[PDB]
Structure formats: structure tokens, C-alpha cells
Structure 1
Amino acid sequence: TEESSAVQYFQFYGYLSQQQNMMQDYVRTGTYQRAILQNHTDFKDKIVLDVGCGSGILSFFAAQAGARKIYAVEASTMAQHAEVLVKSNNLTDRIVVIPGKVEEVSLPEQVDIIISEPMGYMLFNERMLESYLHAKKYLKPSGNMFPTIGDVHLAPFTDEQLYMEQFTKANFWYQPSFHGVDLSALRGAAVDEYFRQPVVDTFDIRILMAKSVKYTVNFLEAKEGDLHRIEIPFKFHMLHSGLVHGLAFWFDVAFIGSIMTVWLSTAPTEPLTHWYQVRCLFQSPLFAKAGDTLSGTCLLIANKRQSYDISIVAQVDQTGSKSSNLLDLKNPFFRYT
């Protein structure tokens, strides 16, 4: 249920250990600080909204950059820990913690810039992007958003070790005589379940088999409802022959400031973040020769558990080998070791 999902979600962010986990991602936290500070003219004497402030860390960055007032909105119990920090850092004159959902609070005034870290796995997990876009009801016409745009990248990979490892787990249910019991009527249900799990992990970029396809969301322009159904068509130009075990996903965000654009990338070519990368495995790999085209569509449909039902249909155009897959982005396999 939606209210069940929502309770668990904010409980997760009420834990200091989880705020600490995001904060200690130096690539993420340092890149946000650089975006904000190297774009200080965007903050200096301005009014700011921090959507989902957590510990308050990005609001402190806005304050360092010279913001006149910052409304730091937070819906989990972390709001009271943030207020302790604002007090102990002598920033009560500038940072104003507002406990509650950004959809439900009411701010004293319109803001010049909204800052947030609303990104989940594959960019869209957690559906916090919708809360981020919802918050534009508080943005002046002249306003900016940090991050400004989000790019989802998508590329086909070959990874037999990963495929076999997931296949093997599923094939527990291929046993005709587990303690004397035939389990094998469930084998297909087991493969279905195991391959519904996106794989959160990093990998060697040499496993990638074609140039990534890019899907862009402009946060300045997008509307909340735009994220209910996200359709990403793709046509890859195969650069290596081999078996395509699935699609790898990562994302970049850009902070498009008046002084400079700063990028935060979770690309596997880049230093690792707590988002790693995400792979959706095909239940059976597609064979492709270099020079082939692999085309289809990834479709994300917003569900009531603050995430997305993902469907990926991909086909090797030359042979018509087709793979069709459903993935539950809510429930990944965290493989990283």
C-alpha cells in the first residue's frame, strides 16, 4: 500500500547511519558543495528551498555561499537532528527547518533557487523527483534549480559470470528431489523472480558493447506528472560481437549555474558513488554481431510504492531475437562487495 510504503521510506531517512552513508559519499557531497560554492552569485542574498534536507548539509552549503534565508524542508524525524545542527552552528538567523512533506508545508515566500538531492538508483527510484518538481510551486519565475537536468544513460553489456550467478540461484527451483520433493514446477516462477531484480554494483567498462543512449529530464521545465510514465526508446549500434546479457544504467546530473555548469556523474567511467550502477538482466541473452542494431524501449511506470515498474523489450533487428523483461526497481539485488 502507498501509506505503508511512505512510512517505511521516511523511517529509513530518520536513521543517522543512513544520513551518514549519503554524507560520506565524497563524490556526491563534494560535488554538491562545488556546484553551490562555485555558483555563489546564484545564492548570494537569495532565498533558497532545500527539498528533503536530511542532516541539513546542502542548506549549510547555501549558507556558506551567502544565501539570505534557506527553508530546509524535511519529512522524516531527521528534521529535529537538522535543527540541532543549525543551532550548534549558529545559523538560526539564516536556515529555517520546516518539518513535514514539501507537498504539505507552507513557506513564507517564493524562492530564487531550489536545491535538492532527490536521485535514487537509475535516477528515478524513490520517486523523490516528483516532490522536487512539485516544489516548483514555490519558485519565482526567474528561478533556478540545482540540479537543473538529469541524464539517464543506458548501454548493453556482456557479463556471463553475473548471468550464471543469478541463473544458479533460480535453479535451486529446478531440483526434482530437494529432500525428496520435486520443486521443478516452480523453476520458471523462480527465474521470473530472480531476473526481476535489478543488479546494483559496479563493473569494468569493457563489458559495454555499444555507445550509451541518453534520456534527459529538464527539471526547470518538467512537470510532476511527466514522471508517471517514462518511455525511453533505444537503438544501439553494436560495437563488439557477443551475448548481450542485459542493459546497464547510470545517470548524470548537471547544476547549470550563472557562473559554471557542474556535473555529478555515476558513470562507470567515473569515480564510484553510493549509487554504483544498475543492470537489468535478460532472462536469456541476445546474440549480436558487431555492426548489428539492438533496438527497443525501456518503459518506467510509476507505482504506489514510490518507485517504478520497469519493462524492457529489446530485439536484435537482424535476426529478430527478442527479449522481454519486467523489473521491480523497488527491490534490487545489492551485489557490491
Structure 2
Amino acid sequence: SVFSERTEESSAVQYFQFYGYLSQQQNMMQDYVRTGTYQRAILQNHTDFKDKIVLDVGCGSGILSFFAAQAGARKIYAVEASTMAQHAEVLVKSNNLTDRIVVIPGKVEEVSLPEQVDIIISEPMGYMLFNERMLESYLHAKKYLKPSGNMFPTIGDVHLAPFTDEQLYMEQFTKANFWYQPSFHGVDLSALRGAAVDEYFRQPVVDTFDIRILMAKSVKYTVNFLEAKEGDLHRIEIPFKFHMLHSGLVHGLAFWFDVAFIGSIMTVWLSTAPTEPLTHWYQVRCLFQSPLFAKAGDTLSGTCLLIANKRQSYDISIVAQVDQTGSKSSNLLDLKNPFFRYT
């Protein structure tokens, strides 16, 4: 299958074991912003669902399918690969919806659907939008979508912006300098200080922050799920040119994302921006190895390159330079192993 070919079995087992727990589903369901915004998107666009055929990619507990049913859907195919599928089936029965919701256990890349659908719904967003690589399953599911079809969400925007945060930056060295001592219980650890530094800096930092640390207006990279193909997400190149609003040291790039549900009646937005109420996605920060000094009015230009790996994540390569000075910085990050800093 397309899924097994892009994924190490080891990663997949862990991934679907994770989503097999009711507590994790609960975690997602109790994110009011997420769940409520999906419900609003679906219900306020009832004409996109009423008496339509629907596909729910990765239904988990099945909540989105129930929202589609509330909006009047004729038939909902709810596809789910973890054991949560058996729990979803139990809820479909106890809510008297077996004639309208059909739970299909398995991977959307491997199961068979009996008919084409009018609309696809899913919640495939991970950290930085792309983490977990579920967007590829979502786009893959388009093989079942009528030419007339719609996608909820319809588009996804990744926002990038430079930030300054001296304490976050210094924390890394404070942690790594544990290894810079000549006699830890009689052992000289210092030879591993460099490797410890590299490791800490390879971790994206998951948490939220005050918007005042942002030093320029964000740049946006848009994915149109109606047009995009799977292959488009294997290599993501995000060029950027920031016009600095404040003078100072840029310690890295902050990432967040929006998705939009573009229905017949209205467009509904779900945002994880630091200006918005907090979600279980928080925001993501990637540090530079070396901070860059920029004056207000200067331009910070470069590229963020995301390369998909078989651990259902991305290798992140960020290169930035201040155009007025030629000062340059790189970093390589592994999105699979983030540092959860939120307290």
C-alpha cells in the first residue's frame, strides 16, 4: 500500500497504538476550539452535507461523523486504522445511526469504499501542520472524491515568523553544559558537550509565547487540499523574506498554522496563532544555532525546507541571512522528537 511504502512498520505500530487510547481521543475532543470549530464549520454549512455522501478520514471516536450526521448527511463512511474503530462502532450503535454511519476499520490507503463521496472530512493536522504526515492520507483519500467534491478543511496555511527569546536560547546551553565538567564522579564528560548542544538544538520547541517576541510580520505558505497531490508533501520548500519591525537578535523561527473550511454558506477558520486562544497544537519554535542580529528595516531572507522521512515526520532545514550584513545561520531539526516545554 502507499502507506506501508512511506512508513516504517515500527513507527506505524506506535502511531496507531497511541490513537487507540480513549484518553488521547478525549484529549483531542476536550480541545474546545478544535471540536467546536469543526462542529460550526459543518453545521453552519449544512447545505454541503444534507443528503450527501461523506467520507471521514481517520474518524477516531467518530465525533466528526456525528457532526456530519447532525448536519443531515445521507451516508458517512468513517475510516479508522487504530483499535479506536471498535469504539466508534459502539457509539454509532448506541446513537442509533447504523443506517447512516458505516465504520470501516483499516488504513484509508488499503480499505475499499463501495461508492464515491461528495465531501471528505478529516482532522489531519499535527504540529507545524505537517507532523504525522496524515495530510498525505487525507489527500490520498481524494481518489474516492467526485469531481464535484469538497474537502473540510479546504486549505491550510503555515505561518513562519522570526522571534527573539534570549532565555529560551540560553536554556539550551545551560542544559548541555552538564557535559562540560572534567570530573563527574571522576569522569571527564566534556568531549560530549558538542554532541549534547547539537541534540538540544535539533528539537523543535512546542509551547506558546507572548506575541511581543515576534520581530516581523509572518510569512504564509498555503496548501490547497483540493488541488494538492500526495507527492507535493514529500518535499516542502518555504522561501521567506522578513522585513524586520524591531531591532535585535533573532534566535529562530516560530511556526503556527490556520485551516479554512470553505463551504457554500460561509468560510470558517481554525487558527493556532499566538494571537488566538490556545489549542493542543500550541505553537512551534525552531532555534538557530547562531542568532542573527537585525536592525529594524533590515531584510531577513532564506528558506525553510521540510523533507518527509519514514518515521511519519519531517527533517527541517532552515537557512537564513541578513541581506544588509551577509550574516548567515543554519539549522537542522527533527520534528519527530520535539521538546514539550509548556508547563
What is the TM-score when the length of structure 1 is the normalising length? 0.99
Deviation at 1:178, TM superposition (A): 1.7
CA displacement at 1:180 relative to structure 2: 2.4
Query: SS state of the match for residue 28, structure 2?
Result: helix
Alpha-carbon shift at residue 106 of structure 1 (Å): 0.3
RMSD between aligned residues = 0.8
Quote the sequence identity (%). Answer: 100
Kindly indicate whether the alpha-carbon contact (under 8 Å) linking 1:256 and 1:262 is maintained by their aligned counterparts in 2: yes
What does residue 88 of structure 1 align with? 94
* Pairwise CA distance, 1:310: 0.6
Deviations 1:63-96 (A, max 9, x none): 0000000000000000000001001111111110
In the TM superposition, residue 177 of structure 1 has moved relative to its aligned partner by 2.2
Q: Which residue of 2 aligns with 1:137?
A: 143
* Cα-to-partner distance string for 1:210-268 (whole Å, 9 max, x where unaligned): 00000000000000000000000101001101111100000000000010000000000
In structure 2, C-alpha distance between the alignment counterparts of 1:44 and 1:170, rounded to whole Å? 57
Please give the per-residue CA displacement for 1:108-156, whole angstroms capped at 9, x wherever unaligned.
Answer: 1000000000000000000000000000000000000000000000000
- Corresponding residue SS for 2:260: strand
- Is 1:108 matched with 2:107? no
- Map 1:284-303 → 2, pairs under 5 A: 284-303=290-309
CA deviation string 1:24-46 (max 9, x = no partner) = 00000000000000000000000
SS of 2:228's partner is coil
Residues 103 and 135 of structure 1 are in contact (CA less than 8 Å); yes or no, is this contact kept in structure 2?
yes
Q: d(CA) in 2 for partners of 1:224 and 1:13? A: 23
Q: Shift in Å at residue 283 of structure 1?
A: 1.9
- The answer for unaligned runs of 5 or more in structure 2 is 1-6
Which residue matches 1:166? 172
Name the stretch that deviates more: 313-322 or 79-88: 313-322
Instruction: Note the alpha carbon deviations across 1:139-186, whole angstroms, 9 max, x for none.
Output: 000000000000000000001111111221111122222222221121
How far 1:287 sits from its partner (Å)?
1.0
Which stretch shows the higher mean deviation, 174-183 or 88-97?
174-183
* SS of alignment partner, residue 108 of structure 2: coil
Q: By how many angstroms is 1:286 displaced?
A: 0.9
Distance 2:174 2:220 in 1: 32
SS at match of 1:115: strand
**In 1, Cα distance between the equivalents of 2:323 and 2:9?**
43
* CA distance in structure 1 between the partners assigned to 2:278 and 2:86 by the alignment: 31
Higher mean Cα deviation, 178-187 or 263-272? 178-187
Corresponding position: 1:273 with 2:279: yes
Name the SS of the counterpart of 1:19 in structure 2: helix
State the secondary structure of the residue aligned to 1:243: strand
Q: Distance in 2 between matches of 1:250 and 1:29?
A: 18
Asked if the contact 1:198–1:329 (Cα under 8 Å) also holds between the matched residues in 2, the reply is: yes
Q: Distance in 1 between matches of 2:166 and 2:91?
A: 48
Q: CA contact under 8 A between 1:191 and 1:283: conserved in structure 2?
A: no
Query: Alignment partner for residue 240 of structure 2, among 224, 234, 241?
Result: 234
Q: Tell me, in whole angstroms, the C-alpha distance in 1 between the residues paired with 2:121 and 2:183.
A: 57
CA distance in 2, matches of 1:57, 1:328: 31
Deviation at 1:321, TM superposition (A): 1.4
TM-score (norm 2): 0.97
Conserved in 2, the CA contact under 8 Å of 1:125 and 1:307?
yes
Correspondences of 1:283-322 after superposition (within 5 Å): 283-322=289-328
| Aligned-partner SS, 2:195 | helix
Q: Secondary structure at the match of 2:47?
A: helix
8 Å CA contact 1:55, 1:79 repeated in 2: yes
Q: 1:4 Cα shift?
A: 0.4
Aligned partners of 1:213 and 1:234 also within 8 Å: yes
Q: CA deviation at 1:282?
A: 1.2
Partner of 2:89, secondary structure, is helix
Unaligned runs of 5+ in 1: none
SS in 2 for 1:203: coil
CA distance in 1, matches of 2:173, 2:271: 31
Query: How many residue pairs end up in the alignment?
Result: 337
For residue 277 of structure 2, give the secondary structure of its aligned residue in structure 1.
coil
The separation in 2 between residues aligned to 1:256 and 1:171, in whole angstroms, is 50
